[PDB]
Amino acid sequence: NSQVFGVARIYASFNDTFVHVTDLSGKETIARVTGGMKVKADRDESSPYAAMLAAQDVAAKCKEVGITAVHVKIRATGGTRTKTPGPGGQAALRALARSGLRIGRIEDVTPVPSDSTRKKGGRRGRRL
Amino acid sequence: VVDPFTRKEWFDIKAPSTFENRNVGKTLVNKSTGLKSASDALKGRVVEVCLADLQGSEDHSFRKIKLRVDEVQGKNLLTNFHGMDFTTDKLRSMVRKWQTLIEANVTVKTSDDYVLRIFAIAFTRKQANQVKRHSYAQSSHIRAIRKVISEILTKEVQGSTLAQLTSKLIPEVINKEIENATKDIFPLQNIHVRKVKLLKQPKFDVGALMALHGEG
Amino acid sequence: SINQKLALVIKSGKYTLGYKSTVKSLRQGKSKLIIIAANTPVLRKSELEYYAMLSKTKVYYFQGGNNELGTAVGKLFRVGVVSILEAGDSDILTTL
Amino acid sequence: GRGAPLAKVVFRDPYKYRLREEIFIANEGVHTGQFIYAGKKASLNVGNVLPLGSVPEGTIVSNVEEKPGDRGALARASGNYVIIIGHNPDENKTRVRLPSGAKKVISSDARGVIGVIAGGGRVDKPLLKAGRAFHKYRLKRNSWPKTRGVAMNPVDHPHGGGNHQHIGKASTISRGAVSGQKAGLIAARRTGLLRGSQKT
Amino acid sequence: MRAKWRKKRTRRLKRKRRKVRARSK
Amino acid sequence: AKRTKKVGITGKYGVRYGSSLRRQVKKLEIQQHARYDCSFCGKKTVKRGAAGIWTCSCCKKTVAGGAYTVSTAAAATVRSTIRRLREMVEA
Amino acid sequence: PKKRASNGRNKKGRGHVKPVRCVNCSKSIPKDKAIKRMAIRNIVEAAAVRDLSEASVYPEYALPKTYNKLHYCVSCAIHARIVRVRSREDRKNRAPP
Amino acid sequence: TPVTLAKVIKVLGRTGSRGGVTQVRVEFLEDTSRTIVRNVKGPVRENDILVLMESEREARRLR
RNA sequence: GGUGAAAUUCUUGGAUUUAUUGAAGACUAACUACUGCGAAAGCAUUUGCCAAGGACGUUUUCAUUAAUCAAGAACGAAAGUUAGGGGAUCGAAGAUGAUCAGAUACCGUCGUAGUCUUAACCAUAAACUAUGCCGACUAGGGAUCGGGUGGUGUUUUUUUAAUGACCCACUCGGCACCUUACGAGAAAUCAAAGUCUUUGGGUUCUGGGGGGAGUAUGGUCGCAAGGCUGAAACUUAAAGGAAUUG
């Protein structure tokens, strides 16, 4: 068991994805890139292909520093927002598997209230 | 143009020896400098760990432990207990349609002056021939269950400390005595302690931290 | 609760109302329970505590003011202290 | 001249056998005949004089000193109080929020009474009367009545003159104007009716 | 012809109409 | 009998001043001239003396507080939050 | 014409229930009405389970499920195909498939 | 770029908006445990050989 | 960030995320139903007090003490309005950025009043079960909540006992439901909308073609916005209601 652990927070959202790596602690982050900082089209920021490339480069920096096995925490925007992961996290986690790293201990974390503040759209909704 | 991974060190954290796996992993600080120490940037970290990895089993994977960094000793650092939750898949996977959900919490300061706010979740269940579809509870019964759970949690915590609390919360003996203590009111599957929290620490208690540590 | 069994005391047993009559009975040894409304000044409070430590009677701090204690004794005024000589029917003297 | 009443507090002098007296701008709730504990090691009541290191985060304290020892400068008028905001334990400073909504970073050894100054709610009652405002000012200082600068002469004030009562040049006077020119809106960021954000 | 703007134009009908009668009376 | 319909204690302000300001001063004069319940002695025996000063006249006590009542809403939040934080200090 | 004898959905004998916000458009629709679906997903999809089990430590541990109970309104449900509009008679066909 | 060879397992059916893109499951020609859904442009029979510029897209139904 | 795709804005003075800790306010999800309670509006965290309350049980009690209600009174969602104390999130007005032939509109970013609350008004809603209220009878069923009763029933365990839960059968009350029509209806549909030309159990309101018009004016209430009461002149052959075919 010569494998050391880290944490990959994958924040999937309907505008962008986040792939973020920290230690077993929570401060002192390792490396994070997004599809939104990967491609330049401003609508492909939350593409599965975008999260795939972000996972590839996070895996590159991760294998360069030497972190091997990673606890995965995956989440949505949450709160009074969407609650549900977009098209990012799935392709990101698949690409992190196909990288050559090691993945364990996946559990969903996403912030969810005991009946928070109002949602945005105002009683009649985002009627388009 | 600076590349701080030429600066970040590697510290091996150690768990209290209640857990069989004393080793957990390695965190990282920046450089021990004058006026800005790596120990000082290490003083307040909190680590979340899967209790399957600490206990060496697999069935215990539905829990998570929050350890607290408080002391460092020469490329080695000691952790102290800070809180326990379940994991979200397990909490949702328990919570079913068609059964009431008995749920309680109590605050208690222990023998040593850790105060803890400690939670307990229990459900209803069927009884093996129940042709009625759903099996709820009268809410007067849920009152009786909260009373018994408050009594049994304050009894099984108040006369102990962090060490005996850890030794009780690992193998699930408290909810064992709870289930055994309320067979006689309502069925109650999935009796569990889901969330304990430290609130106020005592004075720094690092001798009991060695009473956790220091064997190996 | 305490209100029901105090109403039971005023129904059956016997009492005295008022500070002067309370301390007079407590010198005379005719009383067993002293009930103090919590808005009594701390001097008179601790004075009757000292007299209770002398007399080996039971004492109890009625959780409220003398208005609440007047309602608890069925009178339309304030009672700072009420001294139970004997309950008659209440088990208050046995419990608490 | 205050609305906020006072408490003549009788202390004991530890160094000489006498009774040294001090006057406090009281909080609410404090009363005649009240034991009142001042200093660091005391406990956090309403009426006691803790320092800001030994209050926790988020405590209502009034008559808060500004620098260590200067005997009370902040938050003393009839109904004010200072929230403690959040600390920095080394280099011992505490951040407070001031009754003008201000965020200040003051000395952790600054004292303060705990609570909110008595005589709150004073300005919710209309004066109604020149008579009422007259006695308010004749027990403060001679700054009432105020004749309008546009209804003086031009010699008396920079707005005076004209066959109407109008001003002519813009009435937002800057800070780098000289004295005699500063009588108007002084160095205004913005004017006009605030239908807008608190901007802090 | 239509009734909710019978209604809001009715309250503005009554506003203009009441003001002008309060002028003359 | 019935003295006035809706002005109350403000027959001493007459026909002057505008009815709105007579409303606010009706409410606040009721408050600052009404008696209160002294918790120190359980008697309805208080009056105002000045802004803040509230005296009980039977048991001859004084207590500082709001300019027009025995207590304000701000001081209610203050006593509860001091009681909370002092309890968690105890804890 | 009264289209439904259930009026929408099932109060039958309360008065006011609390309202709740549609997931897709945040319409504040009361909880009695307002299409409920409980959707669970595995955190990984169907094609990546073998991939992750091939690339995992801690052999044969578990694989947990995201749960979510999506509320929906009428407008969003019928617009996004959770619901189809049904014939006059099968309106009473209360059976999920 | 390590180009990917593939071999047809079975077609599913022409989807897309205008209809002109079929979906086929293919096996990577060296890993018989790994087959994958894949959008193809022209006409695809069974058991023939595909070329891929990447292997980890596995795109979905198009409308 | 944000979107249908964008731009307003925020960013090397480190924005978003991460972590730690604290504060602030509202909220009370997952349990969450063709379930409960309340006169209704309405009410979902624990615990305590405060008083209430329906139903059940009753070889108790009093013995018509009732049913329905003009004038009259209480409560009365939310928006309002009068001053506080709060004031986080969402957010009419407003600001902009979009979309457009134009957008003072939907979409985007904010933003006051509000949201919250204490004290005081207001008295309205699709306050909708669009079905007055009390009564008696008329048809099949299975689940449901609360109370009761029975069972050579089950279980819990320490051992049968004490329950408590579960099962079977009944009964009263309860929110509903599923089938048929003896019936009702103009019809959708209905266990009440049935027991109506074969027409009458007690009783309260309401409507009399559509507009005009909830306007006029008189009256009262209200700080005000407005409430309750409320026509006429004149105009028009329709306004409509379930249902069939296109």
Tab-separated table of N, CA and C in Angstrom, chain C residues 3 6 15-16 31-32 37 40 43 48 50 55 61 63 78 88-89 91:
chain	number	residue	atom	x	y	z
C	3	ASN	N	-49.603	23.391	41.085
C	3	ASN	CA	-50.811	24.194	41.221
C	3	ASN	C	-51.998	23.359	41.648
C	6	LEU	N	-51.436	22.344	45.309
C	6	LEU	CA	-51.605	23.480	46.208
C	6	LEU	C	-53.068	23.847	46.372
C	15	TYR	N	-52.623	26.222	56.448
C	15	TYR	CA	-51.669	27.089	55.791
C	15	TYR	C	-51.451	28.296	56.676
C	16	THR	N	-50.527	29.138	56.246
C	16	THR	CA	-50.583	30.539	56.611
C	16	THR	C	-50.014	31.359	55.470
C	31	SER	N	-45.047	24.750	61.478
C	31	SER	CA	-45.023	24.615	60.028
C	31	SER	C	-43.979	23.605	59.566
C	32	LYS	N	-44.202	23.081	58.363
C	32	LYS	CA	-43.347	22.065	57.763
C	32	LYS	C	-42.827	22.468	56.395
C	37	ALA	N	-42.149	32.669	46.695
C	37	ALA	CA	-42.230	33.229	45.363
C	37	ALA	C	-40.888	33.846	44.987
C	40	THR	N	-39.280	37.526	45.678
C	40	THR	CA	-38.882	37.994	46.980
C	40	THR	C	-37.456	38.519	46.895
C	43	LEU	N	-32.394	39.118	50.218
C	43	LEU	CA	-32.224	39.179	51.662
C	43	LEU	C	-33.289	38.372	52.393
C	48	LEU	N	-35.264	33.435	55.077
C	48	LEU	CA	-36.133	32.288	55.303
C	48	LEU	C	-35.408	30.984	55.008
C	50	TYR	N	-32.319	30.621	55.960
C	50	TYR	CA	-31.591	30.428	57.206
C	50	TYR	C	-32.516	29.923	58.298
C	55	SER	N	-34.867	25.388	61.383
C	55	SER	CA	-36.068	24.683	61.798
C	55	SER	C	-36.194	23.282	61.219
C	61	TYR	N	-38.857	26.837	46.009
C	61	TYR	CA	-38.908	28.080	45.268
C	61	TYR	C	-39.970	27.953	44.189
C	63	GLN	N	-41.799	28.707	41.077
C	63	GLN	CA	-41.208	29.307	39.886
C	63	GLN	C	-42.133	30.377	39.326
C	78	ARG	N	-51.019	39.421	46.137
C	78	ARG	CA	-49.699	38.827	46.035
C	78	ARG	C	-49.377	38.092	47.323
C	88	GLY	N	-53.066	18.085	54.447
C	88	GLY	CA	-54.361	17.445	54.452
C	88	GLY	C	-54.396	16.307	53.461
C	89	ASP	N	-54.431	16.629	52.170
C	89	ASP	CA	-54.520	15.603	51.142
C	89	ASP	C	-53.322	15.539	50.213
C	91	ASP	N	-49.680	15.117	48.589
C	91	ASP	CA	-48.426	14.428	48.840
C	91	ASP	C	-47.217	15.318	48.600
